[PDB]
């Protein structure tokens, strides 16, 4: 009877399993990894997720460590490496560099070109008669520019392609062999071992530069430590940004009334950004934590060493938190969504993410003539990715009204 994980819901149609688990009485339900056979706890209710992700007895670092019970088929690392950029920066005493390079000051430095670039990419599409692909010709250049200009430094087109390929090949439940999946991480690691210092020295204020230039104990930060930072930034910023912006465009274009309302009321755009983060399902897996001591939540005993997963998508679609959870309702006042997680490990990139998301929403809201070119069921999805992404977003112009 035991349920295997994940649920193979690669499109935006969420698996019926979440509702089945949310209806269970317990705050966590047992599942078994389809890949490793590890037994895992899974939370799907908003209430349970708040308590679990606020608990200091559950450790992210410990669930990332090699050997932990895991949901993914292969370890997400170059073998023999720590591959925990967050722990790295904490160890190096560099938490403030990340906060400073992703905080509201950083956003203020980048929002100008981010908005100009969103507008450049969208106005460039106004010339297309017939069907064009918003994924290839809007999301990928915008997400590539975000990663290069705010995170890694000046990337060549080939380097961008390599890093994007490593993320798509490594961050998967299925669709590639184990050796190909390992090779994604070793290729990314070897790339940054060679190039991270050079990238950190390219012009601009990208985060890798700030990290490489920050004083730490005993000489400059090592090539291995910079490499660990590089791989963290790729997996944190690249497939997330491209997957989310793709899914958010699909949500907007499936709700032309919402787009038309934002066209008439730009002051409503920030509320729509937050609802996009609740409503648009990004990940096919779960955030995870390891218990560092026995604990009991609402009757369930979790033993030290066991791993607790929280499905943010399940949580964001919990009808006990959100009335009509499967309705895209941009003026929803609350409650607070789990699109960026919760607690200690709440996404440190959230301000930069919101900045790019808002730029994208406004580029659409200015042009309510932008339409999906096919029915939503006619969109094809990359199967097996941790971060959902359609193969293409075919779009077309009904008219060219803009302001």
Ligand X SMILES: Cn1cc(C[C@@H]2NC(=O)[C@@H]3CCCN3C2=O)c2ccccc21
CA gap 399, 395 in Å, rounded: 12
CA gap 392, 381 in Å, rounded: 8
CB of 240 vs ligand X, minimal distance in Å: 4
238 binds ligand X (CB under 6 A): no
CA 310 to chain centre: 15
Among 146, 163, 184, 372, the residue binding ligand HEM under the rule CB under 6 A is 146
Give the one entry of ligand HEM, ligand X, none that residue 83 binds, where binding means its C-beta sits below a cut-off of 5 to 8 angstroms depending on kind. ligand X
CA 330 to chain centre: 20
> Which among 110-118, 217-225, 294-302, 349-357 is the span making contact with ligand HEM, rule CB under 6 A?
349-357
Give the one entry of ligand HEM, ligand X, none that residue 352 binds, where binding means its C-beta sits below a cut-off of 5 to 8 angstroms depending on kind. ligand HEM
Among 21, 74, 232, 393, the residue binding ligand X under the rule CB under 6 A is 232
CB of 374 vs ligand HEM, minimal distance in Å: 25
240 binds ligand X (CB under 6 A): yes
Residues facing 172 on adjacent strands: 385
The mark string for 366-395 relative to ligand X (x by CB under 6 A, - otherwise) is --------------------x---------
Give the one entry of ligand HEM, ligand X, none that residue 27 binds, where binding means its C-beta sits below a cut-off of 5 to 8 angstroms depending on kind. none
> How many residues in the chain?
403
Dihedral, CA of residue 323, residue 324, residue 326 and residue 331, to nearest 10: -70
Among 241, 251, 284, 311, the residue binding ligand HEM under the rule CB under 6 A is 241
Give the one entry of ligand X, ligand HEM, none that residue 372 binds, where binding means its C-beta sits below a cut-off of 5 to 8 angstroms depending on kind. none
SS3 content of the chain, % helix, strand, coil (to 5): 50, 10, 40
227 binds ligand X (CB under 6 A): no
Cβ partners under 8 Å of residue 144, min gap 6: 155, 160, 164
Sort strands 29-33 and 370-372 into parallel, antiparallel or unpaired. Answer: unpaired
Among 285, 348, 368, 394, the residue binding ligand HEM under the rule CB under 6 A is 348
- By CB neighbour count within 10 A (0-12 exposed, 13-18 middle, 19+ buried), where does 218 fall? exposed
């Amino acid at each position: 009877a035991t349920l295997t994980y994940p649920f193979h819901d690669w499109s935006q149609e969420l698996s019926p399993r979440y509702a089945q688990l949310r209806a269970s009485d317990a705050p966590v339900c047992p599942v078994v990894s389809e890949g490793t056979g590890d037994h895992l706890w899974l939370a799907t209710r908003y209430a349970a997720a708040v308590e679990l992700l606020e608990d200091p007895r559950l450790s992210s670092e410990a669930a990332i460590a090699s050997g932990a019970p895991r949901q993914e088929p292969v370890e997400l690392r170059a073998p023999g490496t720590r591959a925990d950029g967050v722990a790295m920066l904490r160890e190096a005493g560099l938490r403030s560099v990340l906060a400073d390079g992703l905080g509201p000051r950083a956003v203020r430095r980048h929002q100008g070109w981010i908005n100009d670039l969103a507008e450049t990419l969208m106005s460039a599409l106004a010339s297309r008669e017939g069907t064009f692909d918003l994924a290839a010709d809007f999301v990928e250049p915008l997400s590539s520019a975000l990663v290069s200009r705010t995170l890694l430094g000046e990337l060549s087109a080939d380097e961008r392609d390599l890093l994007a390929h490593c993320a798509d090949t490594g961050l998967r439940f299925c669709g590639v062999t184990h050796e190909e999946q390992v090779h994604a991480f070793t290729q990314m690691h070897e790339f940054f071992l060679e190039h991270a210092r050079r990238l950190a020295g390219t012009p601009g204020e990208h985060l890798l530069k700030l990290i490489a230039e920050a004083p730490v104990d005993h000489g400059p930060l090592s090539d291995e430590a910079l490499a660990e930072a590089g791989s963290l930034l790729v997996v944190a910023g690249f497939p997330t940004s491209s997957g989310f912006l793709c899914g958010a465009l699909l949500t907007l274009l499936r709700h032309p009334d919402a787009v038309q309302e934002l066209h008439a009321h730009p002051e409503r755009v920030p509320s729509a950004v937050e609802e996009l983060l609740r409503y648009t399902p990004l990940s096919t897996g779960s955030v995870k934590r390891m218990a560092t001591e026995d604990l009991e939540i609402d009757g369930v005993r979790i033993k030290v060493g066991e791993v607790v997963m929280v499905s943010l998508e399940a949580v964001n679609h919990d009808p006990d938190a959100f009335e009509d959870p499967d309705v895209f309702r941009p003026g929803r006042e609350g409650p607070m969504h789990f699109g960026f997680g919760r607690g200690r490990h709440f996404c440190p990139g959230n301000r930069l993410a919101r900045c790019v998301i808002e730029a994208t929403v406004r580029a659409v809201a200015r042009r309510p003539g932008l339409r999906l070119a096919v029915a939503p069921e006619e969109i094809s999805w990359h199967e097996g990715l941790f971060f959902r992404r359609p193969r293409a977003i075919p779009a077309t112009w009904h008219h060219h009204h803009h302001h």
